[PDB]
Amino acid sequence: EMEKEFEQIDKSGSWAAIYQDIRHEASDFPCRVAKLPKNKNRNRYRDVSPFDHSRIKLHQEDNDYINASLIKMEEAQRSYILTQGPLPNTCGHFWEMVWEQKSRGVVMLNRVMEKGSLKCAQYWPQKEEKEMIFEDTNLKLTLISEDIKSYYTVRQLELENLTTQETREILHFHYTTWPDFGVPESPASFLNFLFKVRESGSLSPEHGPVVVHCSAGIGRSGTFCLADTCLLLMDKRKDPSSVDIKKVLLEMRKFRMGLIQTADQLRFSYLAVIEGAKFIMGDSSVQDQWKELSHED
């Protein structure tokens, strides 16, 4: 169905119309807390807000607000937290959220500078010997190691609750070559990275939801989660034909606005899912193929 649909859309060249259709149907819920005056400086973009019903609340009495949404995919049985790139004033909240939600993985799909502008704060330590303390949320963060590939880096971080002295390992997955409002180089490079996240165990139901972020937390992040959810649905039923990508996206859009930002990002999601289906249905060669085609070395 999906590969048929994909061919029928490319032929008619109607990706824009298909994408706009989803924009039209998409849920609309209030974002009243996000729009409170006291939270203006907690939002990176005026027009990108978490719905009240699905927002992550910080466990504090001062101000519980963070620009983050819990995407809870009931049928798939996987949850994601989509959030904006933290601001210089919300890095402590970002890590507070990771701690409180018991996340094991953070997926970052942007660079700190893109198109000459700063799309995200430097919210993690770049050097082992220079750890970060977030005074406001009483948290310590230390770079333990990093594994740099050509187009993505995986970092091991240690997060410490300074109140309890409890520590956890966070894995940081940083895709560095995904342009804003753009698409990955190929399905292969995208899937190579997604499977890295998967193979880390960071997506396990044993943990809290993985935190996923680019700059606004909706375009690239939306693309990432849609592809992952569709592959997981397909996997559970071992039935690629049972997956309706647009339906999955619309469901996801119940939890955060604007997920997937361009028609081509939607088109790419189809490509990645169709290609990833090969692995799901038992082709044990494609994963090595993606690794080679990704040029990660």
261 is annotated as contributing to ligand binding? yes
92 is annotated as contributing to ligand binding? no
Q: What angle do CA 251, 249, 233 make, to 5 degrees?
A: 85
Distance CA 246, CA 253 (A): 10
> Which of 149, 145, 175, 139 lies closest to 157, judged by CA?
145
List % helix, strand, coil for the chain (3-state, nearest 5): 40, 20, 40
Q: Which of residues 173-192 bind ligand 598 (CB under 6 A)?
A: 180-181
* DSSP assignments along 49-65, one per residue: ---TTTEEEPS-SS--E
Q: How far is CA 147 from CA 18, 34, 174, 262, 281, in A?
A: 39, 36, 10, 31, 30
In the complex, the smallest distance separating the C-beta of residue 115 from ligand 598, rounded to whole angstroms, is 7
Strand bridging mode 78-83 / 210-213:
parallel
Copy the structure tokens of residue 10: 């490319």
Active site residue 214: yes
Distance CA 94, CA 111 (A): 17
Q: Which of 31, 91, 120, 214 is catalytic?
A: 214
In the complex, the smallest distance separating the C-beta of residue 178 from ligand 598, rounded to whole angstroms, is 8
180 is annotated as contributing to ligand binding? yes
Site string for ligand 598, 47-86 (x = CB under 6 A): xx--------------------------------------
Chosen residue from 216, 231, 249, 277 binding ligand 598 by CB under 6 A: 216
Our CB check for ligand 598 shows the closer of 139 and 272 to be 272
Site stretch for ligand 598 (CB under 6 A), options 96-104, 212-220, 236-244, 267-275: 212-220
155 is annotated as contributing to ligand binding? no
Q: Which of residues 111-150 bind ligand 598 (CB under 6 A)?
A: 119
> Which of 76, 50, 63 lies closest to 209, judged by CA?
76
Q: How many residues bind ligand 598 (CB under 6 A)?
A: 17
Q: What are the start-end ranges of the H helices in the chain?
A: 2-12, 15-25, 32-35, 91-100, 187-199, 220-237, 245-252, 263-280, 286-294
Chosen residue from 215, 229, 269, 294 binding ligand 598 by CB under 6 A: 215
Site string for ligand 598, 248-287 (x = CB under 6 A): ---------xx--x--------------------------
Give catalytic residues, as residue numbers.
Answer: 214
Binding residues for substrate: 180, 214-220, 261
The residues binding ligand 598 (CB under 6 A) are 23, 26, 45, 47-48, 119, 180-181, 214-216, 218-220, 257-258, 261
